[PDB]
RNA sequence: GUUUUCGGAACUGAGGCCAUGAUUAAGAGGGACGGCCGGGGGCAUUCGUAUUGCGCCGCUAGAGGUGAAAUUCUUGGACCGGCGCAAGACGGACCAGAGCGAAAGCAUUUGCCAAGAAUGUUUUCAUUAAUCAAGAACGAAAGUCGGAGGUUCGAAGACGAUCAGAUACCGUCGUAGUUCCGACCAUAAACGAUGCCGACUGGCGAUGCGGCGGCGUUAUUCCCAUGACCCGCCGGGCAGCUUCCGGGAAACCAAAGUCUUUGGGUUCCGGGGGGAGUAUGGUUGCAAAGCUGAAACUUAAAGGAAUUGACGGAAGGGCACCACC
RNA sequence: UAAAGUUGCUGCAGUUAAAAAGCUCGUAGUUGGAUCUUGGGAGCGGCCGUCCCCUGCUCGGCGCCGGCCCGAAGCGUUUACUUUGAAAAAA
């Protein structure tokens, strides 16, 4: 069944972006999903998103723009040090200018460049550009 | 059609979407305040009762189960209410 | 322990009489020696006395059954056939 | 119509007061304590007619059972076969209301 | 997506949003709890209790009139059945098949249906074992099961 | 000597107190219940012509079968017409790009037995799940073992033709078999040549079951309510159409898409062509055979899709006395 | 060894080119829904950035009039993960 809940969320908002919809619906809403979309919120990759808290696992209606190229997800959550993060963005991002690898660390959920300030590392969720 | 207002759907079609496929999953069943002419008291029965209920004092059957909505016995008076 | 592999009750014939004959008596040797549930008392005490008769050592009620089995298959279709003709001969 | 009886006997077993066995139940008829008698179909014919005579004088109902005495033990939830049965107190089972 | 069928159906209840008591329900917590007791002493599974309660007395959810659900009310007093009702009705179905399988031993489909029951019985056994509502020495056996209705 | 004030340790008794202790009920699952639905399954039972045989009756010399004939039947009366009886198969037409079932597969009526999807649900349990080495159930036809039965058909074989030859196609007979019961066997182009679970991504008209709503029409009859139609909607079910979604070597594909912008979960499995699913060893089997399964050697291709030609004892048009009539 | 994305973890293919077990059940294995702490404040620059905090319970000195501050020791679900440190033979 639905093993990875973030994965079926990211590919859902990726298909609607390729087709070109204005706002897509995601069936589950976890803590990891909101901490993912808000990473794309700050970089200006999706429009203003809002969730609906029902008395079950929530749903989300994100707002889309024409900016996102792809928001794929890495599976499973691999261990990522700091001596190999540049060995991950070497083969997972288009170029050194744009594109991000969101990764979870003990500080929280943030992109790969934010972790260079805090010098910390952790598991990897996905990536968008 | 790309732009749809998924936030605030229109209630003429919201009643069309499935009970689990609504934006907030809500049932399509209800209750009502029934009374048979074979009595005068007021009871409350489901709309999909799936079991037979008689009145007090063995007066007259109140509903009959079906595959969907419970068939309200004819001649009876009822008033659909909610919470 | 499981003493023999496939030759069951008919391991008493050792190596004699050939595989096939030993095999097709095994389905009969087993059945004729088995104790059945006496349908009159419920106890599993129906034991073949001689060829044809079956004695229940709970009621001492003898039954003229089959030769190796308690009920031959060709007898139970007849009893069901009789039970159907009887009820139609007179309604 | 049998599974109602099978559900009823089960409810008598956990709640009601029942008495298993021919000799024990014949002691219950003769005191006027028993309220229903159950007899398997493979009961001995003299006993079957003896119980029905006794209960006829004690004015006790006899529900002649369908299956045999082996499965009546499994009906009563026991691993020994039973040939007669008497329900002294129905407990909260509506087995005699039918 | 059923687990012993190729059907991928979708048909079940959808509880309403509001988790409060119905505004027309003039029954109290104790009165509901003693209503469950009346069904409990006369014999009725936790599922069927919630049925007849939402048809005659008209409770939305006993979880919303009382702070508990049906089985937790019966286990609190001692009216709860020993082995669970889903395991009960699977056993009640497995012994019904084998009895039919006793006279129809050419019915190869009923043999295939019985293994699907046995697969679902031996799955619910090792689940309830981990939840300790069944003792770890409890093991399902086909011949002896006919007693446990 | 002695108990305690004393620190420490253990145990029993009364309590006071906690905001006194249980997240939600998955467009995850099991289970209950409701009215259904269905060539799903088993047991029994019933019916229908037909076929073949037999009997009687009628009238008669041919009948069969073939491209053409013959083998074969026939005045001992064949074939054909009538009336019956008997036997074993079979379940036409209705019958569908309809349903059901895990797949193989499943169609006279009726009864029984147990099972099931889907829908409906403000019922219950509360993560019980998904995929699965090993292992287990079922598995067409053929083949095998016992019985029972053996109409039609028909491997083998026998003949009659055809033919240069035909131990082949055609024809006449015809054994095992085809049928049932009980045991084996476990393979099929068992094909949708397409693992299962999950999500997402165009519409369109139909269809099948269930549910909801709606003018009217038509049955009950005496209305409501249930049927039959009609108009929509929802669930999932077999499918089709449609297109620059997208992909693909292409044929084609709403999945074979969401694939260098490569990662949802998970089994099985392929590595140029032969040698070869062979040898061998193990192992299952009554056997036939199945499962597991090499190498030596040899070879530069084998293959997939598509295009143009030529070709066809392929089709449809047309034409020529170096073609025919 | 690279070429070899022709051993494919990164990164192969399995409708027809080699190729999904006939089908289902199933144990190890593998993988598993959501759900339990955020925000407010003080410091400064041109609404934001950064520091800081929501730790508890014996022994000695900036001292003060039992009580306050401060330095020092220990305890306060555990692993995975991550960063820091140590420890790490040369060649």
Same domain? A74 vs A125: yes
**C-alpha span between E134 and E81 (Å, rounded):** 12
Q: CATH no. for residue A21?
A: 3.30.1370.30
Q: Confirm if D14 and D90 have CB atoms less than 8 A apart.
A: no
Instruction: List CB contacts (< 8 A) between D92 and chain E.
Output: 41-43
Q: Which of A22, A38, A68 is the last residue of a domain?
A: A68
Q: Confirm if E121 and E90 have CB atoms less than 8 A apart.
A: yes
Q: Tell me the two tokens of residue A128.
A: 């968008």
Helical packing angle, A5-19 and A31-42, nearest 10°: 40
The number of distinct structural domains making up chain B is 1
Q: Which of A36, A14, A26, A35 is nearest to A57 (CA)?
A: A26
Resolution (A): 3.1
Report, in angstroms and rounded to the nearest whole number, the Rg of chain D calculated over CA atoms: 12
Look at the alpha carbons of D11, D12, D13, D14 in this order and tell me if their dihedral is positive or negative: positive
Q: Tell me the two tokens of residue A12.
A: 């859902």
The HSE-up count of residue C89 (CA atoms within 13 Å, CB side) is 6
The HSE-up count of residue A27 (CA atoms within 13 Å, CB side) is 11
Q: Cα–Cα–Cα angle for B49, B54, B60, nearest 5°?
A: 120
User: Does B55 carry a binding-site annotation?
Assistant: yes
Same domain? A59 vs A103: no
Instruction: List CB contacts (< 8 A) between B6 and chain A.
Output: 23, 25, 61
Same domain? A107 vs A60: no
Q: Which helix (H) or strand (E) holds D84?
A: strand D84-89
In the three-class reduction of DSSP (H, G, I as helix; E, B as strand; rest coil), residue E114 is classed as helix
3-state secondary structure chain A: CCCCHHHHHHHHHHHHHHHCCCEEEECCCCHHHHHHHHHHHHCCCCEEEEEECCCCCCEEEEECCCCCCCCCECCCCCECCCCCHHHCCCCCCCCCCCCECCEEECCEEECCCHHHHHCCCCEECECEC
Asked whether residue E104, judged by its CB, lies under 7 Å from any atom of the DNA or RNA strand F, the reply is yes
Contacts of C89 (CB under 8 A, 6+ apart): none
Counted residue by residue, chain A has a size of 129
Backbone φ and ψ for E28, nearest 5 degrees, come out as -95, 175
Contacts of E72 (CB under 8 A, 6+ apart): none
Residue numbers of the domain that contains B83: 1-83
Same domain? A47 vs A75: no
Q: Confirm if A123 and A80 have CB atoms less than 8 A apart.
A: yes
DSSP string, B32-80: EEEE-TT----EEEESS--S-EEPTTS--EEEE--SSS-EEPTT-EEEE
Q: Which helix (H) or strand (E) holds E2?
A: none
Q: Which helix (H) or strand (E) holds C45?
A: strand C44-48
Q: Cα–Cα–Cα angle for E125, E130, E136, nearest 5°?
A: 65
User: Does B76 carry a binding-site annotation?
Assistant: no
Q: Which of B23, B13, B33 is nearest to B82 (CA)?
A: B33
Tell me which residues from 70 to 89 on chain A have a beta carbon below 7 angstroms from nucleic acid strand F: 70, 72-76
**C-alpha span between E108 and E113 (Å, rounded):** 9
Q: Which of D64, D71, D78, D82 is nearest to D25 (CA)?
A: D82
Q: Tell me the two tokens of residue E104.
A: 């129809």
**C-alpha span between C53 and C70 (Å, rounded):** 9
Backbone φ and ψ for E102, nearest 5 degrees, come out as -75, -30
The domains of chain E are located at: 26-80, 81-149
**C-alpha span between A17 and A71 (Å, rounded):** 10
Q: Tell me the two tokens of residue A56.
A: 């079950």
Q: CATH no. for residue A108?
A: 3.30.1490.10
The number of distinct structural domains making up chain A is 2
**C-alpha span between E48 and E32 (Å, rounded):** 15
Q: Which helix (H) or strand (E) holds C63?
A: strand C63-64
Tell me which residues from 28 to 57 on chain E have a beta carbon below 7 angstroms from nucleic acid strand F: 45-51, 54
Torsion angle of the four alpha carbons A126, A127, B4, B5, in this order, in degrees rounded to the nearest 10: 70
Q: Confirm if B63 and B51 have CB atoms less than 8 A apart.
A: no
Same domain? A30 vs A82: no
Look at the alpha carbons of A44, A46, A50, A56 in this order and tell me if their dihedral is positive or negative: negative
The answer, for A54 touching chain E at a CB cutoff of 8 Å, is: yes
Distance, angstroms, CA A60 to C1' F80? 87
Long-range contact set of residues E37-42: C-beta below 8 Å, sequence gap at least 24: E37/E77, E37/E79, E40/E74, E40/E79, E41/D15, E41/D92, E41/E79, E42/D11, E42/D92, E42/D93, E42/D94
**C-alpha span between E121 and D56 (Å, rounded):** 47
Q: Tell me the two tokens of residue C27.
A: 């389905």
**C-alpha span between C44 and C36 (Å, rounded):** 5
In the three-class reduction of DSSP (H, G, I as helix; E, B as strand; rest coil), residue E38 is classed as helix
Same domain? A86 vs A55: no
Edge to edge, the sheet with strand A47-52 lists A23-26, A59-63, A47-52
Report, in angstroms and rounded to the nearest whole number, the Rg of chain B calculated over CA atoms: 18
Distance, angstroms, CA A39 to C1' F299? 61
Look at the alpha carbons of A67, A69, A74, A80 in this order and tell me if their dihedral is positive or negative: negative
If one counts every other C-beta atom within 10 angstroms of the C-beta of residue E115, the result is 10
Phi-psi region of E43 (alpha: psi -120 to 50; beta: other; left: phi over 0): left
**C-alpha span between D84 and D19 (Å, rounded):** 9
Q: Cα–Cα–Cα angle for E44, E50, E56, nearest 5°?
A: 100
User: Does C47 carry a binding-site annotation?
Assistant: no
**C-alpha span between E24 and E50 (Å, rounded):** 18
Q: Confirm if C30 and C68 have CB atoms less than 8 A apart.
A: no
**C-alpha span between D97 and D93 (Å, rounded):** 9
Chain F nucleotides close to protein (CB under 7 A) are 22, 24-36, 40-45, 101-104, 113-131, 137-139, 145-146, 181-183, 197-202, 210-213, 224-226, 233-237, 245, 257-259, 261-265, 286
**C-alpha span between A11 and A9 (Å, rounded):** 6
Residue A23 forms beta bridges with which residues? A63
Distance, angstroms, CA B47 to C1' F209? 23
Q: Tell me the two tokens of residue E139.
A: 């093991």
Same domain? A76 vs A63: no
In the numeric block, the tokens 């129905």 are attached to D90
CA E115 vs. chain centroid, Å, equals 21
Same domain? A40 vs A75: no
Distance, angstroms, CA B61 to C1' G9? 70
Q: Confirm if E13 and E53 have CB atoms less than 8 A apart.
A: no
CB contact under 8 A, D74 and E42: no
**C-alpha span between D82 and A23 (Å, rounded):** 72
Omega within 30 of 0 (cis) for the link into A97? no
Buried b (16+ CB within 10 A) or exposed e, C19-37: eeebeebbeebeebeeebb
Q: Tell me the two tokens of residue C19.
A: 């595989």
Q: Which of A68, A93, A115 is the last residue of a domain?
A: A68
Phi-psi region of C36 (alpha: psi -120 to 50; beta: other; left: phi over 0): beta
Contacts of C27 (CB under 8 A, 6+ apart): none
Q: Confirm if E35 and E62 have CB atoms less than 8 A apart.
A: no
Q: DSSP state, E54? A: I
**C-alpha span between E88 and C44 (Å, rounded):** 30
Same domain? A118 vs A97: yes
In the numeric block, the tokens 């093991």 are attached to E139
**C-alpha span between C37 and C43 (Å, rounded):** 5
Q: Which of A120, A75, A74, A76 is nearest to A101 (CA)?
A: A74
Q: DSSP state, E127? A: H
Q: Which of A35, A26, A22, A28 is nearest to A66 (CA)?
A: A22
Q: Which of A60, B23, B81 is nearest to B13 (CA)?
A: B23
In the three-class reduction of DSSP (H, G, I as helix; E, B as strand; rest coil), residue D43 is classed as coil
In the three-class reduction of DSSP (H, G, I as helix; E, B as strand; rest coil), residue C32 is classed as helix
Q: Which of C74, C34, C32 is nearest to C52 (CA)?
A: C32
Q: How many cross-chain Cβ pairs, B to E, lie less than 8 Å apart?
A: 47
Q: Confirm if D12 and D92 have CB atoms less than 8 A apart.
A: no
Q: Confirm if A31 and B12 have CB atoms less than 8 A apart.
A: no
**C-alpha span between A103 and E6 (Å, rounded):** 39
Same domain? A62 vs A83: no
Residue numbers of the domain that contains A108: 69-129
Q: Which of A68, A86, A121 is the last residue of a domain?
A: A68
Q: Tell me the two tokens of residue B58.
A: 């063995």
Q: Confirm if A28 and A9 have CB atoms less than 8 A apart.
A: yes
Contacts of A115 (CB under 8 A, 6+ apart): A82, A85, A103, A105, A107, A121
If one counts every other C-beta atom within 10 angstroms of the C-beta of residue A115, the result is 21
Same domain? A112 vs A74: yes
Q: Confirm if C46 and C37 have CB atoms less than 8 A apart.
A: yes
Q: Which of D85, D96, D69, D90 is nearest to D11 (CA)?
A: D90
Q: Confirm if A112 and A128 have CB atoms less than 8 A apart.
A: no
Same domain? A52 vs A104: no
Q: Cα–Cα–Cα angle for B3, B5, B7, nearest 5°?
A: 140
């Amino acid at each position: 069944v639905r093993m990875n809940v973030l994965a079926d969320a990211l590919k859902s908002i990726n298909n609607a972006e390729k087709r070109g919809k204005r706002q897509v619906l995601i069936r589950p809403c976890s803590k990891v999903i909101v901490r993912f979309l808000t990473v794309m919120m700050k970089h200006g990759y999706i429009g203003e998103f809002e969730i609906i808290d029902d008395h079950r696992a929530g749903k989300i209606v994100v707002n889309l723009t024409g900016r996102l190229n792809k928001c794929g997800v890495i599976s499973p959550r691999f261990d990522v040090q700091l001596k190999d993060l540049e060995k991950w963005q070497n083969n997972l991002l288009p170029s050194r200018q744009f594109g991000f690898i969101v990764l979870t660390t003990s500080a929280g959920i943030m992109d790969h460049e934010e972790a260079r300030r805090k010098h910390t590392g952790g598991k990897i969720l996905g990536f968008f550009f | 059609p790309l732009a749809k207002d998924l936030l605030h759907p229109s209630p003429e079609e919201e009643k069309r979407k499935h009970k689990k496929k609504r934006l907030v999953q809500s049932p399509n069943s209800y209750f009502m305040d029934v009374k048979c002419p074979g009595c005068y008291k007021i009871t409350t029965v489901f709309s999909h009762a799936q079991t037979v209920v008689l009145c007090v004092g063995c007066s007259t059957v109140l509903c009959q189960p079906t595959g969907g909505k419970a068939r309200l016995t004819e001649g009876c008076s009822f008033r659909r209410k909610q919470h | 322990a499981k003493r023999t592999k496939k030759v069951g009750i008919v391991g008493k014939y050792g190596t004699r009489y050939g595989a096939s004959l030993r095999k097709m008596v095994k389905k009969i040797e087993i059945s004729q020696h088995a104790k059945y549930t006496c349908s009159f008392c419920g106890k599993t005490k129906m034991k073949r006395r001689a060829v044809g008769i079956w004695h229940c050592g709970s009621c001492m009620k003898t039954v003229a059954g089959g030769a190796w089995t308690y009920n031959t298959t060709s007898a139970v279709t007849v009893k069901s056939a009789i039970r159907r003709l009887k009820e139609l001969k007179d309604q | 119509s049998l599974e109602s009886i099978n559900s009823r006997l089960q409810l008598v077993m956990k709640s009601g007061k029942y008495v298993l066995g021919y000799k024990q139940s014949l002691k219950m008829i003769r005191q006027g304590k028993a309220k229903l008698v159950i007899l398997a179909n493979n009961c001995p014919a003299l006993r079957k007619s003896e119980i029905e005579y006794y209960a006829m004088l004690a004015k006790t109902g006899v529900h002649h059972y369908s299956g045999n005495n082996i499965e009546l033990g499994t009906a009563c939830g026991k691993y020994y076969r039973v040939c007669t049965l008497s329900i002294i107190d129905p407990g909260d089972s509506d087995i005699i209301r039918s | 997506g059923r687990m012993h069928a190729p059907g991928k159906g979708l048909s079940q209840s959808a509880l309403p949003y509001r988790r409060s008591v119905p505004t027309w329900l003039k029954l109290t917590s104790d009165d509901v709890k003693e209503q469950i007791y009346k069904l409990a002493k006369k014999g009725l599974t936790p599922s069927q209790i919630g049925v007849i309660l939402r048809d005659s007395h008209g409770v939305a959810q006993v979880r919303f009139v009382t702070g508990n659900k049906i089985l937790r009310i019966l286990k609190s007093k001692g009216l709860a059945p020993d082995l669970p009702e889903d395991l009960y009705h699977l056993i009640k179905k497995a012994v019904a098949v084998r009895k039919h399988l006793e006279r129809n031993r050419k019915d190869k489909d009923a043999k295939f249906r019985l293994i699907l029951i046995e697969s679902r019985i031996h799955r619910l056994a090792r689940y309830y074992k981990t939840k300790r509502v069944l003792p770890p020495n409890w093991k399902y056996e086909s011949s002896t099961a006919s007693a446990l209705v």
